[PDB]
Coordinates of C-alpha atoms and ligand atoms in Angstrom, one line a residue:
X1 CA -0.4 -0.1 0.1
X2 CA 1.2 2.9 -1.4
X3 CA 1.0 6.4 -3.4
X4 CA -1.3 6.0 -6.3
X5 CA -2.3 9.6 -6.2
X6 CA -0.8 12.5 -6.2
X7 CA -3.1 16.0 -5.1
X8 CA -1.4 19.2 -6.3
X9 CA -4.3 21.3 -5.7
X10 CA -4.0 24.3 -3.5
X11 CA -5.9 24.7 -0.7
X12 CA -9.5 25.8 -1.2
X13 CA -9.8 24.1 -4.5
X14 CA -11.9 21.3 -3.5
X15 CA -9.5 19.0 -2.0
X16 CA -11.7 17.8 0.7
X17 CA -14.5 16.9 -1.5
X18 CA -11.3 15.1 -3.8
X19 CA -9.8 13.2 -0.8
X20 CA -13.5 11.7 -0.3
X21 CA -13.7 10.8 -3.6
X22 CA -10.5 8.6 -3.7
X23 CA -10.9 7.2 0.0
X24 CA -14.1 6.2 -2.0
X25 CA -12.3 5.0 -5.1
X26 CA -9.6 2.9 -3.2
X27 CA -11.2 1.8 0.1
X28 CA -8.0 3.1 1.0
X29 CA -6.5 6.5 3.5
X30 CA -6.4 10.0 1.9
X31 CA -4.2 12.4 3.0
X32 CA -5.7 15.6 3.8
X33 CA -5.1 19.0 6.2
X34 CA -7.9 17.0 8.1
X35 CA -5.6 14.3 8.5
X36 CA -3.1 16.6 10.8
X37 CA -5.6 18.4 12.4
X38 CA -8.4 16.0 13.4
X39 CA -6.6 13.0 13.9
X40 CA -2.5 13.4 14.2
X41 CA -1.3 16.9 14.8
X42 CA 2.1 15.4 15.8
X43 CA 2.4 15.5 12.3
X44 CA 2.7 19.5 12.2
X45 CA 6.4 19.6 13.9
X46 CA 7.8 17.0 11.1
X47 CA 5.9 18.5 8.2
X48 CA 8.0 21.8 9.3
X49 CA 11.1 20.2 9.7
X50 CA 11.1 19.3 5.9
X51 CA 9.5 22.4 4.6
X52 CA 13.0 23.9 7.2
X53 CA 15.4 21.4 5.0
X54 CA 14.1 23.2 2.0
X55 CA 15.3 26.3 3.0
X56 CA 19.2 24.9 3.4
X57 CA 21.8 25.7 0.5
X58 CA 22.2 22.2 -0.2
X59 CA 18.7 20.6 1.7
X60 CA 19.4 17.1 1.8
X61 CA 16.6 15.6 -1.0
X62 CA 16.9 12.1 0.7
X63 CA 15.6 13.4 4.2
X64 CA 13.0 14.9 2.5
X65 CA 11.5 11.2 0.6
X66 CA 12.1 9.7 3.7
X67 CA 10.2 11.8 5.7
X68 CA 7.4 11.8 3.2
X69 CA 7.7 8.6 2.8
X70 CA 7.2 8.2 6.6
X71 CA 3.9 10.9 6.9
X72 CA 2.2 8.8 4.0
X73 CA 2.4 5.5 5.7
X74 CA -0.3 3.4 4.8
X75 CA -2.3 6.1 2.5
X76 CA -3.0 4.8 -0.6
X77 CA -3.2 9.3 -2.1
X78 CA -2.3 12.8 -1.0
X79 CA -4.2 15.9 -0.8
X80 CA -4.1 19.7 0.3
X81 CA -2.2 21.6 2.3
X82 CA 1.1 20.8 2.9
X83 CA 1.6 18.1 0.4
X84 CA 0.7 19.9 -2.0
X85 CA 4.1 21.6 -2.1
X86 CA 5.6 18.4 -2.7
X87 CA 4.3 17.6 -5.2
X88 CA 7.2 17.3 -7.6
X89 CA 9.4 15.2 -4.8
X90 CA 6.5 13.3 -4.4
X91 CA 6.1 12.3 -8.3
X92 CA 9.9 10.7 -8.2
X93 CA 9.3 9.2 -5.0
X94 CA 6.3 7.6 -6.5
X95 CA 6.7 7.0 -10.4
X96 CA 3.3 5.6 -11.3
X97 CA 1.3 8.0 -9.1
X98 CA -1.5 10.1 -11.1
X99 CA -1.3 13.7 -10.4
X100 CA -4.5 15.5 -10.0
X101 CA -4.6 19.2 -10.0
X102 CA -7.8 20.0 -8.6
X103 CA -8.7 23.9 -9.7
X104 CA -11.7 26.8 -9.7
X105 CA -12.1 30.6 -10.4
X106 CA -9.4 32.6 -8.7
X107 CA -10.9 35.4 -7.3
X108 CA -13.4 32.7 -5.1
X109 CA -10.6 31.0 -4.4
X110 CA -8.4 33.7 -2.5
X111 CA -11.8 34.6 -0.7
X112 CA -12.3 31.1 0.4
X113 CA -8.7 31.2 1.6
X114 CA -9.0 34.4 3.5
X115 CA -11.8 33.1 5.6
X116 CA -10.2 29.6 6.7
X117 CA -6.3 29.0 5.6
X118 CA -4.9 32.8 5.2
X119 CA -6.9 36.0 7.3
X120 CA -4.8 38.7 6.3
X121 CA -2.9 40.0 9.8
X122 CA -5.4 42.8 10.4
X123 CA -8.3 40.9 9.6
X124 CA -10.6 40.4 13.1
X125 CA -12.2 36.9 11.9
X126 CA -8.0 36.1 12.8
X127 CA -8.8 36.0 16.1
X128 CA -11.5 34.3 16.2
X129 CA -9.4 31.0 13.4
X130 CA -7.3 31.4 16.8
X131 CA -9.0 30.8 19.6
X132 CA -11.2 28.3 17.8
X133 CA -8.3 26.1 17.0
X134 CA -7.5 26.2 20.8
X135 CA -10.4 24.1 21.6
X136 CA -8.8 21.3 19.3
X137 CA -5.7 22.1 21.3
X138 CA -4.0 23.7 17.3
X139 CA -1.2 26.3 18.6
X140 CA 1.0 28.5 17.1
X141 CA 3.2 26.0 15.4
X142 CA 0.3 25.6 13.0
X143 CA 0.6 28.6 11.2
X144 CA 3.8 29.0 10.6
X145 CA 4.1 25.5 9.4
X146 CA 1.1 26.5 7.1
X147 CA 2.6 29.7 6.3
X148 CA 5.5 28.3 5.0
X149 CA 4.2 25.0 2.9
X150 CA 2.3 28.1 0.9
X151 CA 5.2 30.1 0.2
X152 CA 7.5 27.0 -0.2
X153 CA 4.3 26.3 -2.9
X154 CA 4.6 29.8 -4.8
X155 CA 8.6 29.0 -4.1
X156 CA 8.9 32.3 -2.5
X157 CA 11.5 33.4 0.5
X158 CA 10.1 36.8 0.8
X159 CA 6.0 37.3 0.2
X160 CA 3.6 40.6 1.9
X161 CA 1.1 36.9 1.9
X162 CA -1.9 40.3 3.1
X163 CA -1.2 41.7 -0.4
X164 CA -4.3 39.9 -2.3
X165 CA -3.4 40.8 -6.0
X166 CA -0.1 39.0 -5.0
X167 CA -1.9 36.1 -4.3
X168 CA -3.9 36.0 -7.2
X169 CA -1.0 35.6 -9.8
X170 CA 0.8 33.4 -7.3
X171 CA -2.3 31.2 -7.4
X172 CA -2.2 31.4 -11.6
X173 CA 1.6 31.0 -11.6
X174 CA 1.5 28.0 -9.3
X175 CA -1.1 26.2 -11.4
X176 CA 0.8 27.0 -14.6
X177 CA 3.5 25.7 -13.0
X178 CA 1.9 22.4 -12.2
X179 CA 0.4 22.2 -16.1
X180 CA 4.2 22.8 -17.7
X181 CA 6.2 20.1 -15.6
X182 CA 4.0 17.0 -14.7
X183 CA 3.6 15.2 -18.2
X184 CA -0.4 16.0 -19.8
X185 CA -1.3 11.8 -19.9
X186 CA 0.0 12.0 -16.0
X187 CA -2.4 15.0 -15.0
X188 CA -5.4 15.3 -14.5
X189 CA -6.7 18.8 -14.4
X190 CA -10.0 19.0 -12.4
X191 CA -12.9 21.8 -12.0
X192 CA -15.1 22.7 -9.3
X193 CA -18.2 20.4 -10.0
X194 CA -16.7 18.5 -12.6
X195 CA -18.0 14.8 -10.3
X196 CA -17.0 10.9 -10.9
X197 CA -16.5 11.3 -14.9
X198 CA -13.0 12.1 -15.8
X199 CA -11.6 11.7 -12.4
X200 CA -12.7 7.5 -13.1
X201 CA -11.9 7.6 -16.6
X202 CA -8.2 9.3 -15.4
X203 CA -8.3 6.3 -12.7
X204 CA -9.5 3.4 -14.9
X205 CA -12.3 2.4 -12.5
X206 CA -16.0 3.2 -13.0
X207 CA -18.4 5.5 -12.2
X208 CA -19.6 4.5 -8.2
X209 CA -22.7 3.2 -9.0
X210 CA -25.6 5.1 -6.7
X211 CA -22.9 7.2 -4.9
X212 CA -23.0 10.9 -5.4
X213 CA -19.8 13.4 -6.0
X214 CA -18.7 14.5 -2.5
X215 CA -19.2 18.3 -1.6
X216 CA -17.5 19.2 1.7
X217 CA -16.0 21.9 3.4
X218 CA -18.0 24.9 2.8
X219 CA -16.0 28.4 4.2
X220 CA -19.8 29.1 5.6
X221 CA -19.0 25.5 7.2
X222 CA -15.8 26.2 8.8
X223 CA -17.4 29.2 10.2
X224 CA -19.9 27.7 11.6
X225 CA -17.3 25.6 13.4
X226 CA -15.5 28.4 14.3
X227 CA -18.4 29.6 15.9
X228 CA -19.5 27.0 17.5
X229 CA -16.1 25.7 19.2
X230 CA -15.9 29.0 20.6
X231 CA -19.7 28.7 21.9
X232 CA -19.5 25.6 23.0
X233 CA -15.8 25.3 23.8
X234 CA -15.6 21.1 23.2
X235 CA -15.5 19.5 19.5
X236 CA -17.2 16.2 20.7
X237 CA -20.1 18.7 21.8
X238 CA -20.7 19.8 18.2
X239 CA -19.7 17.7 15.9
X240 CA -23.2 15.9 15.7
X241 CA -23.5 19.5 13.7
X242 CA -21.0 18.5 11.0
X243 CA -22.1 15.3 10.0
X244 CA -20.2 13.2 7.4
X245 CA -17.1 16.0 7.5
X246 CA -14.6 14.8 10.0
Ligands
LIG1 N1 -18.3 19.0 -5.4 C1 -18.1 20.8 -5.6 N2 -18.7 21.1 -5.8 C2 -18.4 22.6 -5.6 N3 -17.8 23.0 -4.4 C3 -17.6 22.2 -4.0 C4 -17.6 20.7 -4.2 N4 -16.5 20.0 -3.0 C5 -16.0 21.5 -2.8 N5 -16.3 22.5 -2.7 C6 -16.2 23.7 -2.5 O1 -14.4 23.6 -2.3 C7 -14.2 24.8 -1.2 C8 -13.0 23.1 -0.2 O2 -11.9 23.0 -0.5 P1 -10.5 22.6 0.1 O3 -11.5 21.1 1.0 O4 -9.7 22.0 -0.6 O5 -10.5 23.1 1.3 C9 -15.0 24.9 -0.6 O6 -15.5 26.2 -1.6 P2 -16.3 27.8 -0.2 O7 -15.0 27.8 0.5 O8 -15.9 28.6 -1.4 O9 -16.7 27.3 0.0 C10 -16.0 23.7 -1.2 O10 -16.9 24.4 -1.0
LIG2 C1 -12.2 26.4 11.7 C2 -10.7 26.6 12.7 C3 -10.8 25.4 13.7 N1 -9.9 26.1 12.0 C4 -10.1 24.4 11.6 C5 -9.7 24.5 10.2 C6 -10.2 23.4 9.5 C7 -10.1 23.3 8.1 C8 -8.6 23.6 7.9 C9 -8.3 23.3 6.0 C10 -6.6 24.2 6.3 C11 -5.9 23.4 4.9 O1 -6.5 22.8 3.8 C12 -5.9 25.1 6.9 N2 -5.1 25.6 6.7 O2 -4.0 25.1 5.8 O3 -4.4 26.7 7.8 C13 -6.4 25.0 7.8 C14 -7.8 24.4 8.6 N3 -8.2 25.2 10.1

């Protein structure tokens, strides 16, 4: 059991739905940020060490490959931040794995990103996210790892993450680059809304009979989850309000 599909799509492009879709297709687990937050928060420091390794004048690529392989043990696929930023290293490690690029309108993406993953530093919603994350046992190291992995995906050392215009152009550049460096036969570009057909064709499987394509992880749902975590101060107490999400 090793990686068959590498999800290179950025966060907030339908990765949790793609995660669920792949788990339906393969009946084996797919990695996602939800795996880290809700199941394995100890992975945060490991991802941080790997991203830190990339910032060295001479990076130890074998250390990174071995670290990626350990993180992804028991998974059939990976999606989302932070793994998407390592899609090149994953491609090298798993030469037979196919690559998915989940994609969507860039303006909707940015809006989604600011609501969940990367608020502007002066946005009051950032404090509500933090307070909510406190309930989940998430600390400040989490934000450093996600920030560093976005910067790593965009291949930038210095960047003003509060500038929407920069993030929009980074998004387009990122998706262009994936399309440039992944051979066409090894890549499926999956637009938000595309559903089973193109995906199943690509992965050489039939469309799941009587099972609809997943639709999960809206910023509306994430805003409500943040609100409810703050109100009740317990995930277990509110999880029934979020069926089928985690
Ligand atoms: N089947 C589907 N059709 C349309 N949008 C979908 C979808 N599945 C997920 N999404 C959207 O993809 C985004 C989440 O992606 P990710 O899981 O990578 O964080 C959300 O966007 P919004 O925040 O605009 O609602 C979510 O609503
Ligand atoms: C709602 C509040 C309690 N925070 C929890 C949410 C869960 C989904 C999520 C997903 C990503 C990337 O998919 C990131 N990210 O990269 O920062 C952060 C979060 N945070």
